[PDB]
Amino acid sequence: ASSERELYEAWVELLSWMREYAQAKGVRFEKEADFPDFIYRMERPYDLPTTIMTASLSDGLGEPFLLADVSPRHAKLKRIGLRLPRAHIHLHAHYEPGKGLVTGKIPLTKERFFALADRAREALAFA
Amino acid sequence: GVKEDLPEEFVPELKKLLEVLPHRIDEYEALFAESPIFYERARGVGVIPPEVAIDLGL
Amino acid sequence: MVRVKVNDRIVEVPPGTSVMDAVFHAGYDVPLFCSEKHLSPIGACRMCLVRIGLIQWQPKLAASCVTAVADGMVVDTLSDVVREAQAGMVEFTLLNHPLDCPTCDKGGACELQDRTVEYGLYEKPLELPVYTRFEFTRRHVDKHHPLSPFVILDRERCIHCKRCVRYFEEVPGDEVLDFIERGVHTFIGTMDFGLPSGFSGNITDICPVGALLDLTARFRARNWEMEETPTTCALCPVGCGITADTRSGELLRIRAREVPEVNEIWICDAGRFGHEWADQNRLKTPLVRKEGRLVEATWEEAFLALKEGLKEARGEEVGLYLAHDATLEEGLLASELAKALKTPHLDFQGRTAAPASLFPPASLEDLLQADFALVLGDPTEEAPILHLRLSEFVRDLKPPHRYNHGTPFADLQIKERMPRRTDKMALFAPYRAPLMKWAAIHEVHRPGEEREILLALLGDKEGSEMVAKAKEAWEKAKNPVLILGAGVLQDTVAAERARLLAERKGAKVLAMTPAANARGLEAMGVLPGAKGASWDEPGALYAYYGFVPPEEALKGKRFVVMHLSHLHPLAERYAHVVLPAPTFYEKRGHLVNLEGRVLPLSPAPIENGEAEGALQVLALLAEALGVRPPFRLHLEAQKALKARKVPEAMGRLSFRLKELRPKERKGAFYLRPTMWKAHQAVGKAQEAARAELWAHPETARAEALPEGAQVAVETPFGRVEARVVHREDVPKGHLYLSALGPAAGLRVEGRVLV
Amino acid sequence: ACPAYAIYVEPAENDPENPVSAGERYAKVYEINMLRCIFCGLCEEACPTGAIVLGYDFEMADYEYSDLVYGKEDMLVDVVGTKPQRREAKRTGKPVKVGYVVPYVRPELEGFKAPTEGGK
Amino acid sequence: GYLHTGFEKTMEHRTYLQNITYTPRMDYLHSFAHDLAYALAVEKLLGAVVPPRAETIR
Amino acid sequence: MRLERVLEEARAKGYPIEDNGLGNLWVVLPRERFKEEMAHYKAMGFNFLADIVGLDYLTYPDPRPERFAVVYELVSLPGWKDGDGSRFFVRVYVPEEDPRLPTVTDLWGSANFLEREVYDLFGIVFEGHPDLRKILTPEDLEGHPLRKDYPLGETPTLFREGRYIIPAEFRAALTGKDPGLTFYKGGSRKGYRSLW
Amino acid sequence: LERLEPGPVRDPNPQITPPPRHLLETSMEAVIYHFKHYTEGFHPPKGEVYVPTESARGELGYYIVSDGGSMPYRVKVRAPSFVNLQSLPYACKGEQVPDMVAIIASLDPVMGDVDR
Amino acid sequence: REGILFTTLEKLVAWGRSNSLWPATFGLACCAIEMMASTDARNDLARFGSEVFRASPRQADVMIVAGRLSKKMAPVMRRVWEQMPDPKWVISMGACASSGGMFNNYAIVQNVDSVVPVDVYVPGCPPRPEALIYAVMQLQKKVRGQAYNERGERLPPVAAWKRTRG
Ligand code: SF4
Ligand code: SF4
Ligand code: SF4
Ligand code: SF4
Ligand code: FES
């Protein structure tokens, strides 16, 4: 319901992290997508806390090692997903009220995400 | 069908002008039927048989 | 033939054929996505599912296309159930198809889009529409991934067009892609990271979405807006039909034009991307040497100059030396002129020691009916896509049935992922080739040895095992086609020996030349005079130049008139008049295709400023010389062409011109037959078309060379920087240097400049 | 949509760091020849960005052909008048007016505030 | 016949939608009638129907 | 209904009878027999000859017997003291070689000008017609203009820095003959209709 | 006015009608059809058609042959006033000279009919 | 000899000329019907020196080329233009005239400015009457010389020295 909001707020959060890691390691970031519902929004209420629907971390070859996508506004089954290229690792962030934002059921933290990132970055290291 | 809905504003004004017009129409008519000069300019002229109206296409 | 009834109409159509094609012949249609022209089907799209009676009705809707035909068959396509299903599959397809239409640049060419709207629509007269049943979030995956210096990849475009992956197998038989993860998690990728195949770019056209696009024209124009100008290629001697997509009188994009004579649906990469020089700074106002510098002049000012230049000239002092980029018309006019006013020679830039008028040409379609191909040369470089035509030959395919639409869209005769032969061809290159992938008979020869091979096949020298097996094979090959290089045509003896063998068992020849329209110009007698000289050599003291010649050419002259399209270092201390010349795109005239076929070249609609063809300019030199050539226009030239006895619209022409003027020297530097030409090295292809220097690891070592770097080299054909290639297929004792521009097969002298 | 073909549009792909429009494509050149503009309105209907929204302008007229092919920056929601109006208002130093009023804005416009019964 | 365009020609070189531009551009008076008449023709052809309210407005 | 005594006759004379499901009907005649046939109709109580549309079928994506075809629309005005509302077309395919055809000035003085137009726009000389002149077009432009063959006459539109549009390839528009970017079409894009 | 109440204002078959623009936001299929509609525009089937109508100016009608392209293969316009003008030398037989002006005017010329 | 070349005269006479504008409309289009509108009934023109609104160049020198035109009209218009007195101004009214709106055709004449020189364009087909007012206000101050172009460039106070006057 309003789950939505905290999720969005979480999505920003996560994104923020993605940038941080990006700068931290100096690794390449690229915003991928923006909301359809921003484009074709044109007088109908927009209030999303960012404009960004999809964004990714790339190796420095334009090849991502990590993709990060939010669900759109009215697009049901609202979750945020991650997936590591060539790994078949598909992560489904739910939000759980009374907890926070959970990875399956385990609460996400930044470090979790960093660990995922480093193992990605270093392992797959396509370039 | 048309591409969007009517204005609401359309309704007042539409009534309004229907009120005024009957009277107005009359007053234009009023200029013509009398004015015996109106007669003397118009009546005789503009002739053509109905039959020929179709033949030549009217 | 097979008795088909598709719904309400019957057709004969011989057996082994796809239902699909008869459908389209019948004027009935279906949505179609997987299978395609010139390619073996798969079932994957599943769009060609119909029901059929023969009279009952199948319990499962077979992909008609995949299935063969049957006599007395009924095909049902107007089925209510079909239409419903079509929509169905459409919806299914659309499930993750990311919304991107306005910025989609598949766009007008989004055939997918068009099928959607054709065949789609909800099952319900409606009083309220429906659009979906879907509503969940889509997949988000990969985009903005540059796949190549020419090609951008945004992955979620793909419909799982399997076409390209398929292409790579079918057409080049060289693979570089693959599906990756399974199920829905899947997606196609490369692990080449930039695909080093010589044919690649066709996939842009094949991509039935906009995943693979020409970045160079990304966000530059829109599909519909372009004028798609069918015209002719000339950039390789195949000179394929092409289509110049243009807006603002500027070349947006080259796409294939699908003549099934000189390609089918196939283009070289060099052809498609190697066009930016045209899109770039080019000569567009006449120049003259002042006293120290070049001066912006008119045509008139030049004509005055021409008279001046021809006031102390006898016309035997004058050299006419053309590019290998001249039309029949310009040829014809040169011919007639050099008659009229004798000059000591006519030549053209790419011209060789022994013509292709020493041999038959052949057809590509001829080459499918063939037995064996004995190959000496390099299809990949010289005649690129012929390489591919051979691949098909080799993969065993017999000529396509062409009907009331030409090509069908399924190969049942051949079926993908399946063998090829090696022993159906013989190969001679002086080094490495991709052909060796399919070759077992392959041989790296020394440069000058080619003749000897020939000699040995005739049996007056002793071959190798390969050459022996070859000997045998040529016997056993009842109608083989002999394929001849640059190293062949430029070396008299080799040519002679070939000439013998190919006569002995009479048989057609495919003559790959570094000249483009070598054969037309040959026919137009643009060959040395009896006293003569070559295009490379000086033979005059004044000159007309359709091209930038050899350095040694420039010395031996004192008035030089160049009709060029750009400036080059060779000119600003050797020029006396430079003039603007039109692109081959925007040139007008007729060319003699390597097949033997005459083709017209459309003028392209492009900006050019001033650039009034060599036709006019050559005419005007003659005007400056007191000689009216009987024509100076296209129109009269067509007449005059026809007069020379050529029937327009792809005549086959025949003539045997025997001149066997020797001219070889033995160098230690090679002119390697290359796939690129100097002026192409601009744009993003700047690097792609830079020079390479190949040498045996041994000689590399011995000269203490860095084998990653680029090295300065000085040749009498210019100073090149060249990446250093180790390659033991090059025997030491020669340096193979990638010859940008025409000219190959030569042993040439230069120096490893330091 | 423009039957007059009244639009010369050079496209471009936005800056990734500094995108002039959030999109990946924008209009690097946006020209309109008002000398034949159809002001289709269908124009508006096709545009999906709702970029194009008819104004309330009509105070346009000048002496020179090629001045009347209004540019991008003249075609914004950020200008304060018509080209001649504005050009006058600098040389004269006078301010602006446009002499129209509506009952209220059109919802479609949602930037610029026009005189509306409460301005002129 | 000192004026003329050849609308009839031109409109074969524009879309159906586009043609609706042309229809009131040859009747200074009742513009909408031309338009309607053309509309109807098309509507008939592909068999499309029009809402009652639409028809009211029309 | 006035129509019907024509219809049985038409059928009797074997003339093909076109019909659109929109209830529009043509009668395909030869040139020769037309005049008299049509004479008989007016006699049979056909009030009003509304139209003459000259047709150029230079290029069509189906075969037709002739390139030039005329079509009359005859009507019976029921609001008149005679008539039944009986409205129908007559189509008459026309040799390109002879752009002749006897007038119907003879039965309506409307015709006069209508046929004049048709001389201008398509090449047809209607036999027995007083005056051919253009009544609608220059006589300094020739070639019986408004034909498919006949030029379309475009000019590039101009924008800053001379940047121009050429109309005739700008268009994403098409004809049925035309294929566009697509290699084929079917479905909707081969037309569509409804019944529901 | 009596017969007026809420209702959709155009045909809701989105195949043949451009869709509402408040839904591009939503489905792809929308987007597709929308895009398509305003670019290419539909293909009506092959046919000729005519409808007679009463204009203010008289008998109005369009004889439209479409070949099933995106543009018609014939647009004939029935222009009443033009036909009505044929009857002018007739109408103006033996008339008086100041009167002749009015006699033209009274018939109503809209030159568009005529000129086309 | 036209009221110039002393400080006084030129301003005087120019005020005279500017304020007395007598429109001769050259209807052949929809423009006319809007033009009669443009005259009366909401706004006036009599306060801009106009009782002349009618067909004599023998009454006017303000040429309003109002509407889309054909080939047949070019010499006609030319001649009509010629049969005006020596100072004379050319308004090119509306899109239909000015560059030929939405027609590209042999029949039509596109870019009316071809036939005769112009000084004022006023786009829009239809435009608003009021735009025309704005235009003549322009034209007022234009012939007053208190005008430029959009590049600050000055211009003559007449239309009639851009091509030959007579
Ligand atoms: S691939 Fe086709 S359907 Fe998809 S966004 Fe591109 S043009 Fe649209
Ligand atoms: S990239 Fe294109 S051609 Fe290749 S499989 Fe995908 S949809 Fe088919
Ligand atoms: S194969 Fe030759 S002819 Fe064909 S596109 Fe390539 S260079 Fe041009
Ligand atoms: S610009 Fe418009 S109002 Fe003026 S003549 Fe042209 S179509 Fe008519
Ligand atoms: S299943 Fe795709 S074309 Fe046959």
What's the N-to-C CA distance of chain A in angstroms?
Answer: 42
CATH T-level assignment (fold) for domain A1-127: Metal Transport, Frataxin; Chain A (3.30.920)
The two structure tokens encoding residue C506:
């009479």
Bridge partners of D69, per DSSP, are D33
Left (φ > 0), alpha (ψ -120 to 50) or beta: where does F158 sit?
A: beta
Report d(CA F106, CA G101) in Å as an integer. 30
Whole domain around residue H62: which residue ranges? Answer: 1-160
- Which residue type is seen at H56? S
The two structure tokens encoding residue C637:
């030239």
Torsion over CA: C60, C63, C67, C69 (sign) = positive
Report d(CA C281, CA C279) in Å as an integer. 7
Task: Count interface pairs A-D at CB distance under 8 A.
Answer: 17
Residue C346: exposure state from Cβ atoms within 10 A (0-12, 13-18, ≥19): buried
The two structure tokens encoding residue F42:
């007016």
Calculate the dihedral angle through the C-alpha atoms of C475, C480, C481, C485, rounding to the nearest 10 degrees. Answer: -40
The two structure tokens encoding residue B39:
């007669």
Report d(CA C105, CA C101) in Å as an integer. 8
Report d(CA C149, CA C165) in Å as an integer. 19
- Which residue type is seen at C437? K
Count other Cβ atoms within 10 Å, centred on residue D108: 12
Whether residue H165 lies inside any domain: the answer is: no
Are C351 and C425 in contact by the 8 Å Cβ rule? The answer is: no
Report d(CA G35, CA G18) in Å as an integer. 9
Dihedrals phi, psi of A98, to nearest 5 degrees: 80, 5
Report d(CA H155, CA H145) in Å as an integer. 7
Shortest alpha-carbon distance between residue G70 and chain E (Å): 6
The length of chain B in residues reads 58
Distances (CA, A) of C337 to B4, B39, C340, C529: 73, 90, 5, 13
3-state secondary structure C61-77: CCECCCCECCCCEEEEC
Report d(CA B38, CA A117) in Å as an integer. 96
3-state secondary structure of C436: helix
Header resolution in angstroms: 5.5
Left (φ > 0), alpha (ψ -120 to 50) or beta: where does C626 sit?
A: left
Q: Do D1 and G24 touch (CB under 8 A)?
A: no
In the stretch 89-118 of chain D, residues with CB closer than 8 A to chain A read 107-108, 110
Q: How many helices (H) and strands (E) in chain B?
A: 3, 0
DSSP letters, C522-552, are HHTT-SB-SS---SSS---SEEEESS---HH
- Is G12 in CB contact (< 8 Å) with chain C? yes
Which CATH number is D111's domain given? 3.30.70.3270
Are C578 and C301 in contact by the 8 Å Cβ rule? The answer is: no
Ligand 5, residue C65: give the atom nearest the CA: 4
**Cα G40 to averaged position of ligand 3 atoms, centre (Å):** 33
Are C197 and C172 in contact by the 8 Å Cβ rule? The answer is: yes
Distances (CA, A) of C303 to C243, C624, C625, C626: 36, 7, 11, 13
Helix residue spans in H58-157 (DSSP H): 74-82, 95-98, 129-143
Calculate the dihedral angle through the C-alpha atoms of E35, E38, E40, E44, rounding to the nearest 10 degrees. Answer: -160
The two structure tokens encoding residue C559:
């008035």
**Cα C160 to averaged position of ligand 2 atoms, centre (Å):** 5
Q: Which of H26, H28, H30, H69 would best serve as a mutation to test chain E binding (most E beta carbons within 10 A)?
A: H30
- Is F145 in CB contact (< 8 Å) with chain H? yes
Report d(CA C605, CA F156) in Å as an integer. 14
Whole domain around residue D18: which residue ranges? Answer: 1-118
Which CATH number is H90's domain given? 3.40.50.12280
Q: Do A42 and D49 touch (CB under 8 A)?
A: yes
Helix residue spans in C363-464 (DSSP H): 379-382, 386-394, 450-458
From the list C399, C358, C634, C642, the residue with the least C-alpha distance to C518 is C358
- Please list every residue in chain C whose beta carbon sits closer than 8 Å to the beta carbon of residue G27: 131-132, 134
Report d(CA C365, CA C393) in Å as an integer. 10
Count other Cβ atoms within 10 Å, centred on residue C69: 23
Residue H48: exposure state from Cβ atoms within 10 A (0-12, 13-18, ≥19): middle
Report d(CA D53, CA A42) in Å as an integer. 11
Which residues make Cβ contacts (< 8 Å) with residue C691, sequence separation at least 6? C674, C720, C721, C722, C723, C737, C738, C740
Torsion over CA: C428, C432, C438, C443 (sign) = positive
Report d(CA A115, CA A83) in Å as an integer. 14
| Nearest CA residue ID for atom 8, ligand 1 | C101
Calculate the dihedral angle through the C-alpha atoms of G51, G54, G59, G65, rounding to the nearest 10 degrees. Answer: -20
Q: Are strands F164-165 and G53-55 parallel, antiparallel or unpaired?
A: unpaired
Report which DSSP code applies to C193.
Answer: S
Query: 């000084």: which residue's tokens?
Result: H119
A68's enclosing H/E stretch is strand A64-70
Report domain extents, chain F. 1-196
Q: Do B41 and G99 touch (CB under 8 A)?
A: yes
The length of chain C in residues reads 754
Q: Is the CB of C386 under 6 A from ligand 3?
A: no
Report d(CA H33, CA E31) in Å as an integer. 13
Residue in G closest to D1 by C-alpha: G38
Structural domains of chain D, count: 1
Report whether the peptide linkage leading into residue G80 is cis, meaning its omega lies within 30 degrees of zero: no
Whether residue H10 lies inside any domain: the answer is: yes
Report d(CA C497, CA C485) in Å as an integer. 13
Which residues make Cβ contacts (< 8 Å) with residue F118, sequence separation at least 6? F52, F54, F70, F124, F126
3-state secondary structure of C393: helix
Q: Are strands C481-484 and C318-322 parallel, antiparallel or unpaired?
A: unpaired
Shortest alpha-carbon distance between residue G66 and chain B (Å): 21
From the list C564, C561, C588, C589, the residue with the least C-alpha distance to C575 is C561
Whether residue H95 lies inside any domain: the answer is: yes
Report d(CA C272, CA C265) in Å as an integer. 13
Q: Are strands A80-84 and C51-53 parallel, antiparallel or unpaired?
A: unpaired
Report d(CA C102, CA G36) in Å as an integer. 11
Shortest alpha-carbon distance between residue D6 and chain C (Å): 14
Crossing angle for the helix pair C634-643 and C328-340, nearest 10 degrees? 80
Does F touch C (3+ CB pairs < 8 Å)? Answer: yes
Report d(CA C263, CA B23) in Å as an integer. 81
Calculate ∠ Cα A85-A89-A92, nearest 5°: 115
Distances (CA, A) of G63 to E41, G28, G66, H98: 8, 37, 10, 32
Q: Are strands C373-376 and C481-484 parallel, antiparallel or unpaired?
A: parallel
Q: How many helices (H) and strands (E) in chain H?
A: 5, 6
Calculate the dihedral angle through the C-alpha atoms of C503, C504, C507, C512, rounding to the nearest 10 degrees. Answer: -60
Are B6 and E56 in contact by the 8 Å Cβ rule? The answer is: no
Report d(CA C33, CA G36) in Å as an integer. 19
Q: Please, after which residues is chain C broken with C–N above 2.5 Å?
A: 54, 124
**Residues with C-beta less than 6 Å from any ligand 4 atom:** E 25; H 29-31, 67-68, 94-96, 101, 125-126
The length of chain A in residues reads 127
Query: 């209607």: which residue's tokens?
Result: F126
Are C362 and C519 in contact by the 8 Å Cβ rule? The answer is: no
From the list C63, C88, C92, the residue with the least C-alpha distance to C77 is C63
Whether residue H166 lies inside any domain: the answer is: no
- Is B47 in CB contact (< 8 Å) with chain E? no
Distances (CA, A) of A59 to A28, A65, C145, C189: 6, 6, 11, 16
Dihedrals phi, psi of C287, to nearest 5 degrees: -125, 160
The two structure tokens encoding residue C416:
């993908």
Residue in B closest to F109 by C-alpha: B56
Are C624 and C310 in contact by the 8 Å Cβ rule? The answer is: yes
Dihedrals phi, psi of C599, to nearest 5 degrees: -130, 145
Residue C152: exposure state from Cβ atoms within 10 A (0-12, 13-18, ≥19): buried
Query: 């109408």: which residue's tokens?
Result: G91
The two structure tokens encoding residue D63:
């002496």
Residue D64: exposure state from Cβ atoms within 10 A (0-12, 13-18, ≥19): middle
Report d(CA C320, CA F131) in Å as an integer. 65
3-state secondary structure of C437: helix
Which residues make Cβ contacts (< 8 Å) with residue A17, sequence separation at least 6? A110, A113, A114
Distances (CA, A) of C653 to C256, D98, F173: 26, 75, 41
From the list C7, C174, C128, C164, the residue with the least C-alpha distance to C79 is C7
Q: Do A75 and C181 touch (CB under 8 A)?
A: no
Which residues make Cβ contacts (< 8 Å) with residue F169, sequence separation at least 6? C226, C227
Structural domains of chain H, count: 1
Q: Of all residues in chain E, what percent are helix, strand and coil, respectively (each to 5)?
A: 60, 0, 40
Whether residue H14 lies inside any domain: the answer is: yes
Report which DSSP code applies to H102.
Answer: T
H65 assigned ligand-binding residue: no
Query: 């069918």: which residue's tokens?
Result: C230
Shortest alpha-carbon distance between residue A51 and chain D (Å): 8
User: D5-23: b or e for each residue (b if 16 or more CB lie within 10 Å)?
Assistant: bbbbbebebbeeeeeeeee
Report d(CA C514, CA C750) in Å as an integer. 20
Crossing angle for the helix pair C450-458 and C492-504, nearest 10 degrees? 30
Q: Are strands C318-322 and C346-348 parallel, antiparallel or unpaired?
A: parallel
The two structure tokens encoding residue A50:
């960012």
**Cα C208 to averaged position of ligand 5 atoms, centre (Å):** 14
**Cα F187 to averaged position of ligand 5 atoms, centre (Å):** 17
Report d(CA G78, CA G49) in Å as an integer. 12
H31 assigned ligand-binding residue: yes
Crossing angle for the helix pair C328-340 and C614-623, nearest 10 degrees? 10
- Is G30 in CB contact (< 8 Å) with chain D? no
Are C719 and C713 in contact by the 8 Å Cβ rule? The answer is: yes
What's the N-to-C CA distance of chain C in angstroms?
Answer: 71
Report which DSSP code applies to G70.
Answer: S
Strands lying side by side in the sheet with D69-71: D7-12, D26-33, D69-71
The two structure tokens encoding residue C105:
């640049």
